[PDB]
Amino acid sequence: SHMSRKIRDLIESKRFQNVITAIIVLNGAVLGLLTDTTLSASSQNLLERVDQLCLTIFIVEISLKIYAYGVRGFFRSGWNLFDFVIVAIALMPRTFRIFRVMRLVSVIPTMRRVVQGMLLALPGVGSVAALLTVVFYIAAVMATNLYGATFPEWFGDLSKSLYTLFQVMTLESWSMGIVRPVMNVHPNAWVFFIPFIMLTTLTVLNLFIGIIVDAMAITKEQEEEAKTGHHQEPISQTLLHLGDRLDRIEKQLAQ
Template sequence: MRERLRAALETPRFQHLIIAVIVINSVTLGLETSATAVARYGTALTVVDHLALAVFVVELCAKVYAYGWRFFRNPWNLFDTAIVTVSLLPTAGGLSVLRTLRILRTLRLISVVPSLRRVVTALLAAVPGMTSIVLLLSLVLYVAAVMGTKLYHETAPKYFGDLPTSLFTLFQMMTGDAWSDITREVMTRHPWAWVFFVLFMLVCTFVVLNLFIAVVVSAMEEEHAEESVHATEELGAVLLAELAELRAEVRELRDRVPAAQNGPAARNGPATQNGPAARRAAGR
């Protein structure tokens, strides 16, 4: 029974069904943000939401029964369980804010769609490599913020009045948001301030941030290479199994050939040699 249920859960048709339920539930949760939609279809939206939650609960129970303790060894299963558990929490009284967390069910697409799983896995694998880049970026931001505060706190106090303000301003500039406006305001009294800001933008935007992209791309390539190796190993295992079956069939055929040679036809062979025709030939 468990084997059949496990096979049914792993079929593409079942996965497509779960994806459809997640998408429909996400749409209904989005419609609940519209007062007009709630006024017209509030009951229907609630019914669809409860049905989707029931499907998710049944799916998790079926997986727990089919996989047993192996269910809890898969991080994606734990991720799905956490999201569904949040949806089951009471939303009355002081916990009414948890009602908004139902939209987290949309994140289940990450665990259901293989391509999204690969992307998230690659991002998580890239976290150790990103740590050094984050430290480098933090160091650059801190040094630049101290310099900006000392140089321009009187010229532009709303941008560089103190260290926290300078940190936020430089982070904003690093994202490319209104950096030219900030620079031009400072340059009205410090014409050579563009040197500081251009160097900062070159280092942070075009160097450090691109390092993040390089680390993520490298992690995704490694993840793709590992998947290729696993696919090759699985294909090799299948080929070896088929080869073993072919060898067994050939061995069985070889065993049948001597048995056929020792059958009735082989046993009648000597009798025909001692028959009348043989004796006449011997008389001649």
């Protein structure tokens, strides 16, 4: 009965998605080729047109979408917003056009759900992250005061110290490159660095594991709802309802 309705049906098809995916990939491949500094002037010119085309197909797509759903209903979705900004900002002649390839995530549903699970897991680890942040800040202040005068390249100011401490937490050359040189001047520096490592590696892995365990559960419920309209009821609710059926046959057997 309606134009709008027939467009939404197009937008939401599997073929349309495949086509926009193919254009993202192509845009991506062309921006990759353009890294090649040896290119002829005409080749670069060509590739830049392919990019122009890709960007155009993107504006038609988003247009189609803002029409078929209306200004307020398109902007209802973070993903549409994201798609919109990514495409919009390219219409302002920043220099990292290649971020356009993140649209593979916004356009492919299973990929969107991976990202959604990870974003959704961030709140629940916020206290673990804050504890890490506090540990970092305190360590960076002490390292600057302790070591900044004698090791200024690594600890000369707070910024330097944070950088160095991040390197130390990743275990990268922590000993041969940082702590042994420091200990030649400050023999007890292991008393600072080895507890720092123990605590940050424990906390970071806590942070990581919390994100991953949650993100995987969220994603998995999203995949279920996407396929069947509902998710698995948690065992605890299943046992709750079993508790109810038991109450209703205990009460029924009064007489």
